[PDB]
Design a protein around this ligand. Structure first.
Ligand SMILES: COC1=C(OC)C(=O)C(C/C=C(/C)CC/C=C(/C)CC/C=C(/C)CC/C=C(\C)CC/C=C(\C)CC/C=C(\C)CC/C=C(/C)CC/C=C(/C)CC/C=C(/C)CCC=C(C)C)=C(C)C1=O
Ligand SMILES: CCCCCCCCCCCCCCCCC[C@@H](O)O[C@H](CO[C@H](O)CCCCCCCCCCCCCCC)COP(=O)(O)OCC[N+](C)(C)C
Ligand SMILES: CCCCCCCC/C=C\CCCCCCCC(=O)OC[C@H](COP(=O)(O)OCCN)OC(=O)CCCCCCC/C=C\CCCCCCCC
Ligand SMILES: NC(=O)C1=CN([C@@H]2O[C@H](COP(=O)(O)OP(=O)(O)OC[C@H]3O[C@@H](n4cnc5c(N)ncnc54)[C@H](OP(=O)(O)O)[C@@H]3O)[C@@H](O)[C@H]2O)C=CC1
Ligand SMILES: C=C(C)[C@H]1Cc2c(ccc3c2O[C@@H]2COc4cc(OC)c(OC)cc4[C@@H]2C3=O)O1
Ligand code: SF4
Ligand code: SF4
Ligand code: SF4
Ligand SMILES: [Zn+2]
Lengths: 115, 144, 156, 96, 29, 208, 386, 176, 63, 342
């Protein structure tokens, strides 16, 4: 029951199919992105980052949430392909000027009060 | 006629105190008009009017060549005008400070300062409040 | 020394030429640009100081940031700043450009354009009047007059 | 009422002067420190106390609408003077 | 007992203001 | 009651009430509520499934003729199970009138795009999607319109912080503009202004 | 492949921070994609964190060429929600300054349109007049453009003791300046070639796309909000509404010039009909009292304190208030939850719909024609992005 | 009530046709435009000789902020914080404590001039005319830090501009 | 058409909040106490959600 | 720690790191990166400059409001050094010129100035001093640059016993002369190399690695009196290195041997330029001298830095040196050069 209306997919199988299609499109786009934006990363780095972004949301079990995630990923792909994005936008995925924040207890205790 | 305009030009060069004063005003303000001296400044600026000029060109100041410490023969700016002549010059009032002096207070600056930005006299912001948390001072004597 | 006198005179000549021909990029972001227009309007006539607008960043000496700089716009401002040949100057005009102003606490506003580019003159106001912007421009000319590139080269 | 700290820095009306080991003093080197020289606490301490022949006096700071809101000051205590909470002027009844 | 003084139009009215387009003919045949 | 109080208009109030009754009778399938505000502003609450029929009827009916869409926006009310309130404002030139149509949705439920009914909606629906995250089905070209490229989240939502999560600055080492977690030199100072005494008795709620 | 071109934001013809992505075959425009948001400042969220008086200066900065018209729309919305009424003298002042503001906006629009086209001269002639009107703004409020004079209770201050005379002196010379502008532009064959039959929009399309103002009237639609849904004292003034015939850029230019003339007419009427009285609603729980009262009376001081710290509370409810701003219908959807802060403020700007229709209006045109169309839509991106 | 801007039909008589042919071939309206520009060439320009000549201003003009005093030299500000509450830009920062003589005075009074929108709401809100927007507008700085005003800077502005500020207030306070 | 989703509602991956501000945060849901300086009770009618207090420090400039 | 100097915040732009640093030589190649890394964390940075203030403009956006303070200084003046190090707990020295000017020889910039800085900062109570010398610093080296570096290193150690001395080797980056010098040679036609560059081994180090190493050495309590050597992860023969540089730039590589005396004569001819020389005799000696191996000194991995290989960052320096034809070529297309490691 729970009486919900879908966006595109009726169960997780169709949602997974759409996820795979979007992943294929991003995988094909990465080399062109590296060429056009004149990025100093490799194609391997770009595809690894695409996989990491996809795996960030691997725990989702709602087909509607997956449909919205695919819609957002398609929005980002359309944005990248048309060059609406600049090199700064593409490089924002890699956080190159962010100092690594530690995760163990002792370093956090040393730096400050935040957990 | 044209000849009367030329005569106006010659009386304009004659009216600035000779050829060298004419050249001084031309190279100092890029203007050679003659107006009635409304007044002078305690810093040397002179203030003139000419009510026959259109609104905007009917009041002007010939700045001093020597402000507080700096040479202002070429380097002048609008911040050198003191507040009373500032009120008259920007047409906030019709009455000059000579005929309508401002009210006297003992905390008002007796010496106007110009824009001191980019100069060792510039303003540097800082916190004006005192310390909030006081730390414990350990005793100066050994504990054993 | 004769060499020091020569470099001082050449220094003065180059500074005079540079400050007497200040070409700002035709570039406006928001409300402040309107007052910029009023500085070119007949009453103030910036052209009489040798100050003429030119659209191309390659033919520009000064960038006037006249308006809010949002996050979406910051890369473009940085890009057209980088395409200015040197020497180049930036005049920050208005509260928005100076520090964010009315939109300082926004998710989409850069809190001051000096985070993106180096700024020479900060013109306060919201908007600054055309006269205040003219005062800032004349202030930039004085700043340029104080340059001594050739003297520093000679002493080094 | 200006006065310098042992470091040579002027002390403001607020009383804040950077400590000897405070690095922030570096912001004044090659520049100056803005200090207003007319201390209000000292200037208001010079005004003469006004003597009035009534128990309750009124103060509006002078200038009518150019002063502060008008307040009424009781003057029954003879060990002290009635002080305006807006302007700082002092009032008393003729005593002794 | 001062009377109310306020920015108002003068008694009667302000002089008429032209607003219609005025483009003369100004030519030969 | 005369000089400083806004005057009333009962004729327009009656006309709007009658027309609201008209609309409700014609479309019982979707119309849930009809209201006439005190300053004569007709409001019609409907079911989401009736977005396209209602608007179509309202713009096409001979007695309606609301051929112009003033604006379309959304309101976020987190306490409601359906978070978002979709508001359409329509103007009729033939009858010199205005009408407001309201519906509801939540984060995961699409609304039918009304570009077919009104061409003006395109950018309005894009803006609602960008600011609130409400998806519109069958929209020609749905994408962000106001926010920066790659911006995460929806700013107009009540939960989103006023200054967001990231800021921008130019970094010389990478020679480009970078996005970093927001740090503020001075924190925005939250004021508590609400008076502890009730202002308007006419709106008092039952004590539950 | 079509050439893909960035038009702006750093472009003279852009008229602000617009990134017009254009697909072109030769110089023919195959597609227009306006990318906006380069001046989105998040104004509506900010307005949510302010009181109703603190949110007023935002409406100055929405459309920076029609400041008081933006203020008036917001003030009307808040007054409708408060169930109060501004005094008659305030309403006459509001209409007078709204017409002065319409003059300012129309000068800016027409001269910047001519400047894009290439006729650079009329700009300098008309900006001196704009300067004098800025002086009028400044005398009344102390600010040249962002005045913040119109408040939800009326106006902030009464006119200074000689302002009407100077407004009269300015108004009796302006028609000749309009005449000189028309001599420059109206009958020039080059201007007509650059404007006639460019950006033609039908009445049906203009209505459906959400157009308003001149973009309607150039296509023959007879609609002016001052006539159909009057506000303040607009029902007491007489003026004609210009109407076009062809729906092109040329017809929109003629409409704006005639609108300028009709604004002169309305100003003349407002000057001769200004009544006496107070300038804000005589209700100290909404409008602040005078300073002498604030310094003499206990109630006046309490109300001054509370109005400037917490602000007045607005009874719960939502309104959509629209005015005939110089660029079209300008609206506010204002939602009050009963407190002194607005719960929601959606701003409707005509430029949003006009720019959304720019792609439609540019079908079958060249690059220069697209520049002319952007000029003829009268776009300011403060109101578009907000 | 409406008029038409482009609904006029041209006459088709031989004289009108010949006049239009002369307009087309001999470029009469272009000479009209040339005449208009030539006319403007011989007018007096509306330019002013800045900085020697200034633009007109008003007593209500909003400029650089200043903190004022009573004629005794005592500060007017009592730290009510109404200016800080009303400021739409949150540009004002205030800290206060009892003075050594028990007076209610500020210990911190900052205005961030790059946050300020120069609206004048603070001088309206001030109940003792302590904070004002003075007449000055020529205070461009070379660094951002110089535009972060503390209490010393604002008191110095008041001391420097009091003569003109009092005269401006005297000319406008009856409209307030 | 209805699809009968069975799982608990979860929108974290769509909100765009950084994960640090999702996992390490604690909210308080409460009816605020009446301000003891006043007798009005109108500020004690609705429920409030607010986040945990984090570090605040002193700006080196201006404090 | 003097409460005002207690770290606060999340280590960002508006935070307080507790560092107050005076960076001599901040207007150079390494100085901009050092100031950027210091201002990222919210440090107070004092920049002494003798150049035209225009030339410091690029350092303005590196800090928050008030966090970067610019002060005029003179290298021959010790009162000026006192003025600029009075309130700092860290002093970094990056002063150095590749060529010798009329008013400053190598011994002035590498012995006198570093010694004066060390003496004055020790007198002023500065807690930490970081000095930069070269990896190849030596008392009897053929280059007077390196002889002066070694003498100045000893002088600094004598004047500030707890100073951290860092010895990098051929920093490469966007504004680095070493990467640029090879690129510059293409205009002439042929690349002149002594012995065809087959008898020289280089171990270049990335600029960001050196800046991070300096920053970490500041925050390291046990790095006080240590001496570090900052070298890259790979060693190349000069021939292979220049060949890789020319392959990344997509320029035709035409190497030819040039005898030592001819190259010295060319350097002397280029030395008479009143402006910045294209090359000098000292530069010729330093280019064809193999990088030393110092396994007994702590390295970047002792400061927590993982050295960046040149293969990963060469394109960001050399894409500017390409023609339009090869401007979009990807990074992994150039077949990394041959390393002579052990
Ligand atoms: C990054 O740093 C550097 C620079 O900065 C920008 C340089 O300019 C620079 C030198 C710059 C060169 C391009 C100067 C060379 C001069 C030209 C290429 C002309 C050379 C050819 C002849 C002089 C002209 C006639 C040809 C003859 C064979 C006859 C070097 C080496 C450098 O390293
Ligand atoms: C073969 C020659 C080749 C080179 C030729 C170059 C062109 C010829 C030289 C032209 C010189 C003209 C510039 C000097 C004009 C000075 C004007 C004067 O007003 O400047 C003052 C300052 O003068 C400058 O400091 C010095 C100017 C001259 C500098 C030295 C010139 C030496 C020339 C040597 C030429 C050598 C050429 C070698 C290569 C050929 C300050 O004025 P300023 O404050 O702005 O005014 C603001 C406006 N106010 C006044 C109304 C407020
Ligand atoms: C055709 C019309 C005019 C043509 C010629 C006009 C020139 C006449 C007057 C110009 C005088 C000299 C112009 C100065 C511009 C040259 C570049 C410059 O200004 O920089 C000075 C630069 C500063 O660099 P550094 O301090 O070492 O370090 C900073 C880098 N990080 O050093 C120098 O260039 C000093 C050289 C002095 C220039 C020689 C004097 C004039 C030259 C002859 C003119 C050419 C015609 C033959
Ligand atoms: N490959 C490399 O770059 C590595 C560099 N070396 C050492 O590392 C340090 C930094 O190197 P790098 O940044 O590349 O060199 P740069 O030439 O780029 O910068 C040198 C700095 O020192 C200043 N300076 C130079 N001479 C003087 C002087 N006589 N008086 C005052 N200041 C002066 C410069 O100021 P100004 O611009 O005004 O002249 C400048 O800021 C230097 O000590 C260098 O010797 C270590 C191994 C190699
Ligand atoms: C060149 C002269 C004589 C004037 C005209 C002018 C400037 C400077 C800048 C600009 C400009 O006009 C163009 C086109 O019209 C607007 C309209 C704008 O809003 C009304 C706006 O705000 C950013 C910007 C612009 C352009 C702009 O940047 O000086
Ligand atoms: S500073 Fe004020 S006038 Fe200038 S762009 Fe910002 S809001 Fe508009
Ligand atoms: S003028 Fe307005 S923005 Fe500026 S300090 Fe006063 S209230 Fe705040
Ligand atoms: S300046 Fe005026 S409003 Fe502000 S705290 Fe002082 S007395 Fe109160
Ligand atoms: Zn008193």
């Amino acid at each position: 029951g729970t009486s919900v209306k879908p966006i595109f997919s009726r169960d997780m199988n169709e949602a997974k199919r759409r996820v795979r299609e979007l992943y294929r499109a991003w995988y094909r786009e990465v080399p062109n992105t590296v060429h056009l934006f004149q990025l100093d990363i490799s194609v391997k780095q770009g595809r690894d980052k695409v996989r990491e972004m996809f795996m960030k949301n691997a725990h989702v079990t709602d087909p509607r949430v997956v449909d919205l995630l695919v819609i957002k990923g398609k929005m980002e792909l359309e944005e990248t392909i048309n060059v609406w994005k600049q090199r700064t936008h593409i490089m924002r995925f890699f956080h190159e000027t962010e100092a690594p924040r530690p995760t163990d207890f002792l370093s956090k205790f040393y730096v400050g009060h935040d957990p | 006629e044209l000849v009367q305009v030329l005569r106006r030009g010659l009386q304009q060069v004659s009216g600035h105190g000779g050829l060298r004063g004419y050249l001084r005003v031309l190279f100092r303000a890029n203007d050679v008009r003659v107006g009635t001296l409304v007044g002078e400044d305690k810093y040397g600026n002179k203030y003139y009017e000419d009510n026959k000029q259109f609104f905007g060109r009917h009041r002007w100041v010939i700045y001093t060549t020597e402000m507080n410490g700096r040479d202002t023969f070429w380097d002048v700016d609008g911040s050198m005008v003191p507040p009373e002549w500032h009120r008259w010059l920007h047409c906030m009032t019709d009455d000059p400070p000579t005929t309508k002096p401002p009210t006297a207070r003992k905390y008002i600056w007796t010496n106007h300062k110009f824009n001191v930005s980019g100069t060792p006299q510039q303003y540097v912001p800082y916190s004006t409040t005192r310390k909030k948390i006081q730390e414990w001072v350990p005793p100066s004597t050994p504990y054993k | 020394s004769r060499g020091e006198y020569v470099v001082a005179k050449l220094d003065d000549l180059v500074n005079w030429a540079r400050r007497s021909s200040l070409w700002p990029m035709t570039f406006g972001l928001a409300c402040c640009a309107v007052e910029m227009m009023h500085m070119a309007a007949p009453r103030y006539d910036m052209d009489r100081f040798g100050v003429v607008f030119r659209a191309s960043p390659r033919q520009s000496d000064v960038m006037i940031v006249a308006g809010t700089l949002t996050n979406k716009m910051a890369p473009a401002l940085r890009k057209v700043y980088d395409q200015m040949p040197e020497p180049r100057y930036v005049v920050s005009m208005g509260s928005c450009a100076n520090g964010g102003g009315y939109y300082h606490y926004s998710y989409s506003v850069v809190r001051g354009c000096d985070r993106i580019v180096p700024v020479d003159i900060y013109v306060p106001g919201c908007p600054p009047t055309a006269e205040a912007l003219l005062y800032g421009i004349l202030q930039l000319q004085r700043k340029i007059k104080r340059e001594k590139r050739l003297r520093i080269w000679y002493r080094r | 009422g200006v006065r310098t700290s042992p470091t040579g820095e002027k002390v403001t009306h607020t009383g804040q002067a950077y400590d000897d080991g405070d690095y922030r003093r570096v912001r004044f080197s090659d520049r100056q420190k803005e200090v207003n020289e007319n201390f209000a606490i000292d200037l208001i301490a010079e005004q003469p106390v006004s003597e009035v022949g009534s128990r309750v006096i009124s103060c509006d700071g002078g200038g009518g609408a150019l002063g502060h809101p008008r307040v009424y000051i009781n003057l029954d205590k003879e060990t002290k003077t009635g002080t305006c909470g807006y302007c700082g002027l002092q009032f008393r009844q003729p005593h002794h | 007992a001062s009377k109310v003084k306020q920015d108002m139009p003068p008694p009667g009215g302000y002089g008429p203001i032209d607003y219609k387009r005025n483009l003369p003919r100004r030519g030969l045949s | 009651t005369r000089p400083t109080i806004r005057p009333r208009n009962d004729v327009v109030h009656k006309q709007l009430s009658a027309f609201g009754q008209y609309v409700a009778e014609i479309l019982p399938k979707y119309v849930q509520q009809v209201q006439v505000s005190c300053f004569n502003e007709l409001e019609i609450f409907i079911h989401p499934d009736g977005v396209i029929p209602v608007l179509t009827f309202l713009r096409d009916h001979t007695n309606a003729q609301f051929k112009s869409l003033a604006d379309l926006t959304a309101v976020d009310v987190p306490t409601r199970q359906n978070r978002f309130e979709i508001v359409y404002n329509l103007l009729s030139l033939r009858f010199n009138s205005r009408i407001r149509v309201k519906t509801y949705t939540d984060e995961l439920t699409p609304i039918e795009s009304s570009v077919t009914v009104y061409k003006a909606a395109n950018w309005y629906e894009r803006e609602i999607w960008d600011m609130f995250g409400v998806f519109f089905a069958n929209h020609p070209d749905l994408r962000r319109i106001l926010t920066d490229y790659g911006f995460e989240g929806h700013p107009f939502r009540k939960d989103f912080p006023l200054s967001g999560y990231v800021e921008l600055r130019y970094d010389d080492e990478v020679k480009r503009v970078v996005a970093e977690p927001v740090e503020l030199a001075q924190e925005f100072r939250k004021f508590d202004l609400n008076s502890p005494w009730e202002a308007f008795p006419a709106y008092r709620q039952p004590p539950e | 492949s079509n050439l893909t071109l960035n038009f702006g934001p750093q472009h003279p013809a852009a008229h602000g921070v617009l990134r017009l992505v254009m697909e072109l075959s030769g110089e023919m425009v195959r597609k227009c994609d306006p990318h906006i948001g380069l001046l989105h400042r998040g104004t509506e969220k900010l307005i949510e964190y302010k009181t109703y008086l603190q949110a007023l200066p935002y409406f100055d900065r929405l459309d920076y060429v029609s400041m008081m018209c933006n203020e008036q729309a917001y003030s009307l919305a808040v007054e409708k929600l408060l169930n109060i009424q501004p005094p008659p003298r305030a309403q006459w002042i509001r209409v007078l300054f709204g017409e002065i503001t319409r003059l300012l906006n129309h000068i800016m629009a027409v001269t910047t349109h001519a400047l894009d086209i290439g006729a650079m001269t009329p700009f300098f002639w008309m900006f001196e007049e704009r300067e004098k009107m800025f002086e009028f703004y400044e005398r009344v409020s102390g600010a040249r453009m962002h005045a913040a004079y119109i408040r939800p209770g009326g106006v902030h201050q009464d006119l200074p003791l000689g302002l009407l005379d100077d407004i009269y002196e300015f108004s009796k010379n302006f028609s000749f300046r309009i005449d000189e502008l028309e001599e420059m532009l109206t009958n020039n064959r080059i201007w007509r070639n650059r404007t006639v039959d460019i950006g033609v929009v039908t009445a049906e399309d203009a209505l459906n796309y959400g157009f308003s103002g001149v973009m309607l009237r150039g296509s023959g639609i007879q609609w002016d909000l001052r006539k159909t849904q009057p506000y303040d004292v607009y029902d007491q003034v007489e003026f004609d509404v210009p109407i076009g015939s062809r729906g092109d850029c040329y017809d929109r230019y003629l409409c704006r010039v005639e609108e300028m003339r009709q604004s002169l007419r309305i100003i003349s009427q407002c000057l001769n009909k200004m009544p006496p009285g107070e300038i804000k609603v005589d209700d100290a729980k909404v409008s602040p009292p005078k300073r002498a009262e604030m310094k003499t009376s206990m109630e006046s001081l309490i109300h001054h304190f509370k109005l400037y710290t917490e602000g007045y509370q607005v009874p719960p409810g939502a309104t959509y208030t629209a005015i005939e701003a110089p660029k079209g219908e300008f609206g506010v959807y204002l939602v009050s939850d009963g407190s002194s802060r607005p719960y929601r403020c959606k701003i409707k700007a005509p430029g949003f719909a006009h720019l959304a229709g720019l792609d439609k209006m540019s079908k079958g045109h060249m690059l220069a024609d697209v520049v002319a169309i952007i000029g003829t839509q009268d776009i300011v991106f403060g109101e578009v992005d907000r | 009530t409406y008029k038409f801007v482009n609904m006029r039909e041209p006459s088709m008589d031989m004289k009108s046709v010949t006049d239009r042919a002369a307009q087309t071939l001999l470029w009469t309206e272009l000479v009209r435009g040339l005449g208009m520009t030539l006319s403007y060439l011989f007018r007096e320009p509306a330019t002013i000789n800045y900085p020697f000549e200034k633009g007109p201003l008003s007593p209500r003009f909003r400029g650089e902020h200043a903190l004022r005093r009573y004629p005794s030299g005592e500060e007017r500000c009592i730290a009510c914080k109404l200016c800080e509450a009303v400021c739409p830009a949150q540009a004002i920062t205030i800290e206060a404590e009892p003075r050594a003589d028990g007076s209610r005075r500020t210990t911190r009074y900052d205005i961030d001039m790059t946050k300020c929108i120069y609206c004048g709401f603070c001088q309206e809100a001030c109940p003792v005319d302590a904070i004002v927007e003075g007449p000055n507008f020529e205070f461009s700085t070379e660094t951002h830090e110089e535009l972060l005003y503390n209490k010393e800077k604002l008191l110095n502005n008041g001391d420097k501009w009091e003569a003109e500020i009092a005269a401006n207030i005297q000319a406008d306070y009856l409209y307030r | 058409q209805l699809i009968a989703v069975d799982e608990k509602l979860d929108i974290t991956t769509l909100t765009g909040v950084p994960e640090e501000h999702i996992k390490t945060r604690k909210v308080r849901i409460f009816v605020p106490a009446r301000n003891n300086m006043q007798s009005g009770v109108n500020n004690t009618k609705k429920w409030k959600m607010e986040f945990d207090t984090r570090e605040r420090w002193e700006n080196p400039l201006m404090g | 720690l003097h409460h005002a100097l207690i770290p606060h915040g999340k280590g960002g732009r508006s935070s307080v790191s507790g560092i107050v640093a005076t960076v001599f030589g901040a207007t150079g190649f390494l100085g901009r990166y050092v100031v950027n890394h210091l201002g990222r964390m919210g440090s107070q940075v004092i920049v002494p400059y003798r150049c035209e203030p225009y030339d410091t403009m690029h350092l303005r956006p590196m800090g928050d409001l008030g966090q970067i303070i610019f002060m005029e200084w003179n290298g021959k003046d010790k009162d000026s050094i006192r003025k600029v190090v009075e309130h700092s707990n860290v002093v970094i020295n990056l002063v150095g010129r590749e060529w010798e000017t009329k008013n400053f020889d190598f011994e002035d910039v590498f012995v006198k100035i570093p010694h004066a800085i060390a003496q004055v900062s020790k007198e002023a109570g500065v807690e930490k001093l970081i000095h930069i010398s070269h990896l190849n610093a030596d008392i009897k080296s053929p280059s007077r640059y390196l002889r002066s570096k070694a003498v100045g290193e000893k002088e600094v150690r004598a004047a500030f016993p707890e100073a951290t001395i860092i010895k990098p080797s051929d920093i490469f980056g966007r504004e680095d002369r070493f990467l640029n010098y090879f690129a510059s040679m293409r205009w002439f036609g042929g690349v002149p190399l002594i012995s065809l560059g087959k008898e020289t081994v280089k171990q270049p180090v990335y600029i960001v690695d050196v800046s991070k190493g300096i920053i970490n050495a500041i925050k390291d309590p046990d790095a006080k009196g240590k001496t570090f050597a900052f070298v890259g992860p790979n060693r190349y023969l000069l021939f292979d290195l220049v060949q890789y540089i020319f392959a990344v730039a997509y320029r035709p590589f035409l190497p030819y041997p040039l005898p030592h005396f001819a190259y010295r004569w060319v350097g002397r001819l280029f030395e008479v330029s009143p402006f910045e020389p294209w090359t000098t005799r000292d530069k010729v000696e330093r280019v064809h001298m193999s990088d030393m191996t110092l396994p007994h000194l702590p390295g970047l991995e002792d400061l927590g830095i993982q050295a960046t290989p040149l293969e990963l960052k060469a394109i960001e320096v050399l894409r500017r040196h390409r023609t339009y034809r090869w401007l979009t070529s990807e990074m992994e297309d150039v077949k990394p050069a041959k390393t002579v490691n052990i």
